[PDB]
Every structure is written in structure tokens, then in C-alpha cells.
């Protein structure tokens, strides 16, 4: 998964 805390 992407993850809930990934940002960009």
C-alpha cells in the first residue's frame, strides 16, 4: 500500500 503517512 501507499501508507497513511506518505506525502509528496
Amino acid at each position: 500500500a501507499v501508507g497513511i503517512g506518505a506525502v509528496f
Partner: antibody
Amino acid sequence: QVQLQQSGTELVWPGTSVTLSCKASGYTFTDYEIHWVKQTPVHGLEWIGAIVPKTGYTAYNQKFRGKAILTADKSSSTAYMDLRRLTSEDSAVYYCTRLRNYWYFDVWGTGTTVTVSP
Amino acid sequence: DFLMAQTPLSLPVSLGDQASISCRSSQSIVYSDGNTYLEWYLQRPGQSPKLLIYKVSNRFSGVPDRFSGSGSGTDFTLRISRVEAEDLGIYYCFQGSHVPYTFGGGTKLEIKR
């Protein structure tokens, strides 16, 4: 050994609350998110929510909002899930699993059985 | 809301035959980096779920080459070219692009007679 060590079977009375623990071992706890999954015969697998140990940030499946509370303890490398006001619908096997951003659930705990009964 | 419709619910097969499991998303699950985070897990009786495929087509290390996956957009398929006794269990697709993440309803792979 890279592992997630889950707490033992919970036999609990209806209306009570319970704390489930997921202890990370053999890797860096704060490098991965912790995700919780509920498993039942009727609903299959359900994504409960997740926590980011580094920031304490959480996200929930709205169906579990108010039912589940996720925390992460950096110093003990342990993730916790409180399940609140238990009913028979909460009887299930609960898994924790880890996630590095953009990868996948490679390592899973062996699951905690929760049995709700008076 | 990025629900996964997984079919069929149960798939009776003979060992050695081919198996095909399908998962359809209500809307596109392509993530903003261009990747689609669509995974397939297997859960056998008494065991934890186990990762098979990630990013629609990629085999997790150790997974036999009998397993493959394909699709794009809203339509995804897991294929087992030849089913073996160790493959029996419940397969779940999993949508990891958009929160809340969601599982398909499961496909129980069983022996036909």
C-alpha cells in the same frame, strides 16, 4: 528475527474493553507503519486502520471509529489497539502487520483471537 | 468508495488445473505516482495472510511462478497456471492506493469432485 509478536487470546465479557499488543522485533519500529486487520468468517478481512509510529498519526476505517484506538510506544517498540465496548460482533482474529511507504504487508503477526461472551 | 468486488466467492478446481480470480474496483485505483497498489493475499486455515502479488503484477520474493497477476484501471486478475495442494485457502485482493484501504470479499479455492 523480523517478527511482530501479538498478545494472547482474549476471553472477555460483553461491554468491557480490551488492549491488544503488537511487539516489533528484529527491525526498526519507527521505519514502518503498523496496520491492523480484522478477520471473521462473515466479513473476511477488514482493514481497521493504521498508525505511523514516528509521528503518532492515525487513520481509521470509519466503520471502526470509536471501536478501535491505535497507539504506538516508541520506547518499547510496541503498537497497541484498544477495542471498546465489546459485543459478539467484535469476536474475531485481529492481525497487526507492518508497512513501509509504497511497499506492502510483508510481515504479519500470528493474530490475536478475541472471544466475547458472558 | 474504492470497494473491491471479488469474484467468484468459491472456486472449485482440480489439482493441476488453471485458476483465475477477478477483482473489480468501483473506480480507478491508479495512485498519483502512476502505480496501482493492488495486492493479492492468501490466507490458509490456521495461518496469517500471506503476500503473493504487489503492484498488480509483481511476485513477492519466494512466491512460485505459477502465480501471476494482471490488469489496469478497475479490472484485475490473479492467475494460478497449475493449482497445487498448498494453494488451497482464501484469496483476497487488496486496494492500497486510497484510504481507507479495502479488501475484496475473498475467493475460497477448493477441490472439485
